């Protein structure tokens, strides 16, 4: 007799085998890719016209609300509505339906594309006691450049093509994180302070170079509401401008690099 | 066909061949040139697959298998059947994921993000070619290399430990499988410590970096932070096969013999032999 | 090239901040201090600690349990110093050798190795409420507590459920680097080849899939450092462009994507089910399949090749063969 | 640290599995020339005269051979076995009738012992045979023999450390592992599975579930007869210079057929010959032997694959003397 045998050619690890699979199918189909849908859905189309009743595989492929009661008062409820109300100044290069859109004017100011920023909230993101959490130097005076490192403040901003662009008047810091994220800057020549994302920074001691722009389109770097605090979609609408500027800053970027 | 947020961000360019001829979608799929070419390699690599299969005994999955050829044809041309179609399959993975990966920078720049991540697939695919270009160029026969079936590969991992008496005591062995454990562990970590800070449950309020980094000084005495830890993670699991290409490669070119005697260059200094 | 991903450039220094815990934020010991080249590629704050007293408990049971294991270590080299440096890799603490079924084994023969295990088991017990009671005190899920749990739980499994379910305790893993590396092949060896056991291979493909989901997922959110992915949490309550990117990035390329926070789902079951299919594997190994290739063979699953020498009849089977 | 490219490679399984062996040029270059010592057959001499029986005194085992043919196995014997020595190790110069040197009583039943496996073990030795050359490797003393426990240096030719030496009790870990392939495997396959029949080396079964009554508790084998398989295996393919796959697929380490090669088989064989080898004709000799010769437990040296093979898969790559000197087997 066996150990794990049963009737007629069964066995034990044979039914484990059966079963794990359907655990697995489980988890993924009918938790996993359902949570992957909290986002983004429902889906889009040449206008879905059914205005009445809703289409039977939207409703399946969703999961049932979750809140997050966030730190600082509020909830926020996924999946829900949140349609693109921006009128993208974009244009239809076919009549297919995947084909891609062109920019129709600047692509840069309009926000489309590689220069697109999400729709985050008019709030500044706040560290774990209610302070306002990206904070320039001149605010956080308790934080510090580590002995070691260029001090950027002073040092000329050098854009692509090779031209003195403004000067690094400020760091501003992640309170929460300890955390650089952006260097303010001048810009010579039009009286006014702009942001830019260390991401787009090369830091030498001598000079910030910036290859994402041209010095000229400086100037239409998003402003801020204020001075000295920024909001989550202005982080948005900042960082995105130069993300742009990879793909739309020359017209040679955007055809084949060969 | 389309995700609420998407539709501002599908715009033209950002290819590196082709221009506008091949930057459309299909469905969900960017296609581009390398799309195309992606495409191309695999209906000719999972057709050869296909024909071979045929020629074969058995059409279970299981106990499929595409073998290279012996090893007196060395470098050269083998019959199909022999070894022949498994030359030709090969050639077909390379193409299909060299083409992956450079369609995968093409989505990178029309998104204008990284490139880190056609980057990171390099890897596993240079790990591919250590197996089954290098190392058998190395020794001089394709019929070095890995066998084409659900199993039979496993057979094939087998002996070649096998070969070297003890697989375990390889050193590139040894940090390949630390780097594959550690990975593991951290990805559990990261993702544990991420759903802990959004989902407290019992409608406690989300919680904050602060939070996050407070937790781990608290039971480990570090944080590595934020950014850093997906750093890390990418350096950790590319290590898994970065170091472990040269255990791979020395088996064979640089050692014959098995892979404890190999720790002899300690065990037998003379000053505490 | 965003250089942010590969090194920080200018590191911040500032006041340390210390989130308060529902309990012990008396336990917290030592002081911060920075690291400027650790800073370079993390954060540069090392310390300070809690120490609680699971914590402690955790210390105490380890540090017996290490003790128990160099101390035996140092008398299979007869406490010579020299010869213990040089051999320590090939030095171990082994489980009986004899067949005593469940009976406790006698101290030269396993006794101190089952007595090594208890102080190890309890170490791991504690040091799990730690990661546990460290998470409810600072107001957090306890995802990271289970899936450690299952760690644990597989350790368990090749350390004493296993032993204790077919009733040995000789099949132990012994402790020591190789000698905990010869245990593998041995008992591979005794149930027929563990690439044929499925649990196996799911443990694999999971381990293997954290590698892609890793370096996937750190990949991504690096290429969008500069839209701040990296702030994890903020992208989870309101989606940035960062995440909008990320996802787009994956569901132009294979099809379908995640959200922020469901990767981070998948990447926590990925690593889960690594522990939880081994333990699968184990618990069945022994109790219930003697010899796993033949197990696959016995359902049709084993592929079978040609013979290239010529097959070779078992000479002990031929008539008149010595025993 | 490495060995430099190229290696040789061989084949021993269907393409795609990875079987074969990978050996390193230099190294068989180096074991070859060594092997390559062995002495030519001498001439052949025309059997002239009586049978040895009837002019000599005491001659028991080669009695049926004339004087020529027997003088001619006396000056192989000498130098296959005491070059360096010569006649004198086994005779008293002025008669060559007593056995007073223990090297003569010993040289006795070592020519029944070779006979033997001439003989009886041709399932293993073929048609190549073995000499007292095959072991001996012109000295007394063979370099590779084995005692009760461990011994280093494998090869007695060479002066042992302090740590080496077998009373240095420091030294066991290492003494056990350079026997093993340097593995940390705790286990002496010598004493185990070569000195004696009295262990089974097969341990993996041969039903897929496990069979209800030899399957829980004290009915199981320890894992340990697993180790200590394992440490034979390693130990017996670093004592032909070989790996698993020269024998096995490792796809099914416990199946034939297929999964197995002749040389396995013959492997086998080996395992039962050195048994016998050493039970009933070397084992006995520590009545005959002087106590410089035996172990810490009045054991004399025992053979085991090594003292054959020294790190060949044939021993001497194959070279035979078998037609050349008939008097040492087969015996019809
Ligand atoms: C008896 C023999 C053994 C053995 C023999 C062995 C060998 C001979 C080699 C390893 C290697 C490795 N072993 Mg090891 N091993 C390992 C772990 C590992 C890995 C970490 C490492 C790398 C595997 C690899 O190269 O993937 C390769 C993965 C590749 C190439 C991925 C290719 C992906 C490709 C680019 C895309 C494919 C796409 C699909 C076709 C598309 C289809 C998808 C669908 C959805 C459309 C562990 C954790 C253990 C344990 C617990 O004991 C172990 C024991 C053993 N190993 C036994 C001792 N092992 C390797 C190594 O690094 O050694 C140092 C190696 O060469
Ligand atoms: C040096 C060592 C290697 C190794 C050692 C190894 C071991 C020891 C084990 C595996 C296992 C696996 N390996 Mg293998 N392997 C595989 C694929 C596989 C799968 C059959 C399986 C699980 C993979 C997984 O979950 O990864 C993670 C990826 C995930 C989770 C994404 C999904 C991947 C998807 C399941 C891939 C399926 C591929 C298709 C079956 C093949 C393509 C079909 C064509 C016609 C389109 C590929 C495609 C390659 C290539 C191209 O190099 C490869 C190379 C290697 N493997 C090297 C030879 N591998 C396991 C198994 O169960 O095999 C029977 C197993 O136990
Ligand atoms: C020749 C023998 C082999 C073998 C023998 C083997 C066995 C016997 C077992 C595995 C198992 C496994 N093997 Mg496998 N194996 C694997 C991969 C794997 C793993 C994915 C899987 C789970 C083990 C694990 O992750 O532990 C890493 C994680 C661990 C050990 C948990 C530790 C957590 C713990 C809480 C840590 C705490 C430590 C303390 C801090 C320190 C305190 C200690 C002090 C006090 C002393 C690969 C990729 C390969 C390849 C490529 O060949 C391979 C080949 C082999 N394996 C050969 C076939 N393997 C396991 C399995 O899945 O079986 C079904 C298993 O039981
Ligand atoms: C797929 C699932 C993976 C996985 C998952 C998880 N794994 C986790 C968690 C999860 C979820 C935890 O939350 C927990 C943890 O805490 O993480 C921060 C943890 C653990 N996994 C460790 C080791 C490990 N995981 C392994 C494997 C897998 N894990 C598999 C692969 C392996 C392998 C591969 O062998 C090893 C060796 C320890 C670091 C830790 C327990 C310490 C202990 O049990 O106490 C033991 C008590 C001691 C005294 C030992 C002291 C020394 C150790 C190194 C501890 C030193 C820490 C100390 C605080 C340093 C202070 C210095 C400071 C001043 C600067
Ligand atoms: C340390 C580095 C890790 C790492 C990293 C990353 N991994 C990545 C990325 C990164 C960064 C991606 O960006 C990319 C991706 O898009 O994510 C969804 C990807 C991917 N990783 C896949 C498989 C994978 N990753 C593995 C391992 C690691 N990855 C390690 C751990 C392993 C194993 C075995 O471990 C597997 C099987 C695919 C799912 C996907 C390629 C799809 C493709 O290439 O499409 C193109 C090809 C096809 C659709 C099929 C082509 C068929 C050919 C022509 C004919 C078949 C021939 C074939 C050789 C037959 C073999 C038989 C087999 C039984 C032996
Ligand atoms: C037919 C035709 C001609 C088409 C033309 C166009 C064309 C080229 C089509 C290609 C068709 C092909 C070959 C399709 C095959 C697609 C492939 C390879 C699918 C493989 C999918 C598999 C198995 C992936 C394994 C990894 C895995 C478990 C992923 C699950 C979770 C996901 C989706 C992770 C990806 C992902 C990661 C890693 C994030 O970090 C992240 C961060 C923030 C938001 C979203 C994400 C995100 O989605
Ligand atoms: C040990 C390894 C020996 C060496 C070297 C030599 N001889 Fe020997 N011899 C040996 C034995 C065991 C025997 C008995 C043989 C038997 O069949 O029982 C002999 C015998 C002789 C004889 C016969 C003499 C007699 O017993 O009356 C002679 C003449 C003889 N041996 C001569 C001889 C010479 C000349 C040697 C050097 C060339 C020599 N022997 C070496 C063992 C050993
Ligand atoms: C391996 C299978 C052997 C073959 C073939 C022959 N001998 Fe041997 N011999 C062998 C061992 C393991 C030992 C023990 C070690 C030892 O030195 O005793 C011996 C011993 C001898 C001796 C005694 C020498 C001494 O102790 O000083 C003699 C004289 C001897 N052997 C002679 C001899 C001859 C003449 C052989 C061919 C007929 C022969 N041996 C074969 C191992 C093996
Ligand atoms: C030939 C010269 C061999 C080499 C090299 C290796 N093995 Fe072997 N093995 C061989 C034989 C003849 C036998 C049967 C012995 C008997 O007396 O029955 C074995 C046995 C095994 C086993 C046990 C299989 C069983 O039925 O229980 C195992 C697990 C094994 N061998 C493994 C193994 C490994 C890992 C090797 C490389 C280190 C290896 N063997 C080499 C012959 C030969
Ligand atoms: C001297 C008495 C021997 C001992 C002890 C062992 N072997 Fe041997 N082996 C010996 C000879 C004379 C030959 C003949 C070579 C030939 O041409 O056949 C062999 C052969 C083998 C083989 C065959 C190798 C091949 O390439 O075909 C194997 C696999 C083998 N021997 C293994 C082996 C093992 C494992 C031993 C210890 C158990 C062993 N041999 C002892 C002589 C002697
Ligand atoms: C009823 C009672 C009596 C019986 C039950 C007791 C019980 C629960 C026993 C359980 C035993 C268990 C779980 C045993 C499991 C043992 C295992 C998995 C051992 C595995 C590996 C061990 C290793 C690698 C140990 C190596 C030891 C050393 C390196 C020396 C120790 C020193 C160190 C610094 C440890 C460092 C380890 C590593 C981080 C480098
Ligand atoms: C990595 C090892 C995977 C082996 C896969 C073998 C699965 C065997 C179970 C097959 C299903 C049962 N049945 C009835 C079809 O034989
Ligand atoms: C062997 C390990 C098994 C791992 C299983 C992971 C497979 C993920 C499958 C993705 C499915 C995608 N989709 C859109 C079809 O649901
Ligand atoms: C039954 C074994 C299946 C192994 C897992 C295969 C992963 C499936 C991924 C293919 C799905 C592709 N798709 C439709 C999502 O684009
Ligand atoms: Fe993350």
């Known amino acids: ?258 | 066909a389309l995700l609420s947020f998407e539709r501002k961000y599908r715009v033209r360019g950002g290819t590196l061949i082709g221009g506008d001829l091949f930057d459309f979608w299909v469905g969900p799929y960017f296609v581009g040139f390398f799309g195309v070419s992606a495409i191309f390699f695999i209906f000719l690599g999972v057709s050869l697959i296909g024909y071979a299969a045929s020629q074969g005994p058995t059409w279970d999955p299981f106990a499929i298998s595409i073998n290279p050829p012996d090893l007196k044809y060395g470098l050269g041309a083998a019959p199909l059947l022999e070894g022949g179609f498994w030359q030709a399959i090969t050639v077909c993975a390379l193409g299909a994921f060299i083409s992956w990966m450079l369609r995968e920078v093409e989505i990178s720049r029309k998104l204008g993000i990284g490139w880190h991540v056609p980057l990171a697939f390099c890897v596993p695919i240079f790990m591919f070619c250590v197996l089954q270009v290098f190392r058998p160029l190395l020794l001089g026969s394709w019929g070095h290399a890995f066998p084409y079936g659900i199993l039979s590969h496993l057979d094939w991992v087998n002996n070649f430990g096998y070969q070297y008496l003890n697989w375990h005591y390889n050193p590139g062995h040894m940090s390949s499988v630390s780097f594959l454990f550690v990975n593991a562990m951290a990805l559990g970590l990261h993702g544990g410590l991420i759903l802990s800070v959004a989902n407290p449950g019992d409608g406690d309020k989300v919680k904050t970096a602060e939070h996050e980094n407070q937790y781990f000084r608290d039971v480990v005495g570090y944080s590595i932070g934020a950014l850093s830890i997906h750093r890390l993670g990418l350096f950790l699991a590319s290590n898994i096969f970065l170091t472990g290409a040269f255990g791979t490669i020395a088996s064979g070119p640089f050692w014959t013999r098995g892979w404890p005697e190999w720790w002899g260059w300690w065990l037998d200094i003379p000053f505490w032999s | 090239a965003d250089y942010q991903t590969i090194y920080t450039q200018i590191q911040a220094r500032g006041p340390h901040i210390t989130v308060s815990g529902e309990w012990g934020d008396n336990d917290r010991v030592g002081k911060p201090f920075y690291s400027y080249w650790l800073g370079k590629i993390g954060d540069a704050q090392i310390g300070p600690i809690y120490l609680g007293a699971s914590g402690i408990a955790a210390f105490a049971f380890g540090s017996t349990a290490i003790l128990i294991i160099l101390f035996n270590m140092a008398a299979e080299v007869h406490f010579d110093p020299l010869q213990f440096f040089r051999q320590f890799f090939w030095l171990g603490l082994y489980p009986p050798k004899a067949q005593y079924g469940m009976g406790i084994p006698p101290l030269h023969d396993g006794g101190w190795w089952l007595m090594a295990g208890l102080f190890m088991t309890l170490s791991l017990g504690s040091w799990w409420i730690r990661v546990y009671s460290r998470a409810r005190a600072l107001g957090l899920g306890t995802h990271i507590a289970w899936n450690f749990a299952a760690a644990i739980f597989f350790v368990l499994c090749i350390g004493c459920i296993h032993p204790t379910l077919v009733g040995s305790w000789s099949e132990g893993v012994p402790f020591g680097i190789w000698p905990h590396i010869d245990w593998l092949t041995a008992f591979s060896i005794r149930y027929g080849n563990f690439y044929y056991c499925p649990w196996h291979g799911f443990s694999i493909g999971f381990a293997y899939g954290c590698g892609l989901l890793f370096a996937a997922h750190g990949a991504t959110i690096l290429a969008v450092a500069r839209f701040g992915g990296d702030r994890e949490i903020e992208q989870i309550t309101d989606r940035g462009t960062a995440v909008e990117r990320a996802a787009l990035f994956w569901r132009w390329t294979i099809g379908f994507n995640a959200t922020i926070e469901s990767v981070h789902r998948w990447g926590w079951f990925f690593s889960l089910m690594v522990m939880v299919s081994a333990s699968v594997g184990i618990l069945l190994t022994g109790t219930f399949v003697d010899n796993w290739y033949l197990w696959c063979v016995k359902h049709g699953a084993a592929p079978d090749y040609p013979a290239y020498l010529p097959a070779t009849p078992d000479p002990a089977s031929l008539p008149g063969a010595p025993k | 640290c490495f060995e430099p490219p190229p290696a040789t490679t061989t084949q021993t399984g269907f393409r795609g599995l990875s079987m074969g062996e990978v050996l390193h040029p230099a190294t068989v270059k180096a074991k070859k020339e060594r092997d390559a010592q062995y002495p030519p057959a001498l001439a052949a001499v025309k059997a002239e005269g009586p049978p040895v029986s009837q002019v000599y005194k005491n001659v028991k085992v080669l009695g049926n051979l004339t004087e020529a043919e027997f003088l001619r196995t006396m000056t192989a014997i000498t130098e296959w076995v005491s070059p360096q020595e010569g006649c004198t190790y086994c005779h008293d110069e002025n008669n060559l009738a007593s056995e007073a040197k223990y090297p003569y009583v010993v040289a006795r039943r070592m020519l029944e012992m070779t006979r033997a496996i001439n003989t009886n073990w041709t399932q293993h030795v073929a048609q190549t045979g073995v000499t007292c050359y095959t072991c001996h490797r012109g000295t007394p003393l063979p370099p590779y023999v084995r005692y009760l426990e461990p011994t280093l240096p494998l090869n007695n030719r060479e002066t042992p450390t302090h740590v080496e030496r077998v009373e240095t009790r420091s030294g066991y870990v290492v003494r056990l592992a350079k026997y093993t392939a340097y593995s940390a495997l705790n286990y002496d396959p010598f004493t185990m599975f070569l000195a004696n029949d009295k262990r089974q080396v097969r341990v993996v079964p041969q039903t897929a579930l496990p069979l209800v009554g030899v399957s829980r508790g004290k009915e199981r084998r320890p894992l340990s007869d697993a180790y200590a398989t394992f440490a034979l295996m390693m130990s017996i393919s670093d004592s032909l210079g070989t790996n698993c796959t020269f024998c096995h697929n490792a796809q099914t380490f416990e199946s034939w057929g297929k999964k197995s090669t002749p040389q396995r088989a013959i492997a086998w064989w080996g395992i039962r010959m050195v048994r016998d080898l050493n039970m009933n004709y070397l084992a006995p000799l520590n009545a005959s032997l002087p106590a410089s010769r035996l172990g810490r437990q009045g054991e004399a040296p025992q053979a085991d694959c090594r003292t054959c093979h020294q790190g060949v898969t044939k021993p001497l790559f194959g070279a035979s003397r078998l037609k050349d000197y008939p008097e040492l087997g087969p015996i019809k």
């Open chain 1, 1 to 258: 007799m066996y150990h794990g045998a049963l009737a007629q050619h069964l066995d034990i690890a044979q039914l484990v085998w059966y079963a794990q699979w359907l655990v697995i199918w489980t988890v993924v189909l009918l938790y996993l890719r359902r949570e992957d849908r909290r986002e983004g859905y429902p889906l889009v189309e040449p206008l879905g016209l059914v205005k009445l009743a809703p289409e039977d595989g939207q409703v399946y492929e969703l999961p049932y609300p979750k809140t997050f009661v966030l730190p600082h008062g509020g909830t926020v409820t996924v999946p829900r509505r949140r349609p693109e109300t921006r009128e993208l100044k974009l244009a239809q290069t076919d009549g297919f339906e995947g084909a891609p859109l062109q920019p129709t004017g600047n692509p840069l100011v309009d926000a489309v594309g590689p220069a697109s920023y999400a729709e985050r909230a008019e709030v500044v993101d706040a560290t774990v006691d209610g302070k306002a959490k990206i904070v320039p130097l001149r605010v956080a005076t308790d934080f510090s450049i580590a002995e070691g490192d260029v001090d950027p403040r002073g040092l000329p901003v050098v854009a692509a093509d090779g031209v003195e662009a403004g000067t690094v008047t400020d760091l501003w810091v992640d309170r929460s994180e300890h955390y650089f994220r952006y260097l303010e800057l001048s810009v010579a020549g039009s009286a006014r302070t702009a942001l830019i994302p260390l991401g787009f920074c090369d830091v030498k001691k001598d000079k910030i170079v910036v290859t994402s722009i041209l010095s000229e389109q400086f100037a239409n770097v998003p402003r801020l509401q204020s001075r000295d605090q920024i909001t989550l979609r202005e982080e948005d609408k900042v960082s995105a401008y130069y993300a742009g500027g990879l793909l739309y800053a020359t017209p040679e970027r955007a055809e084949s690099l060969l």
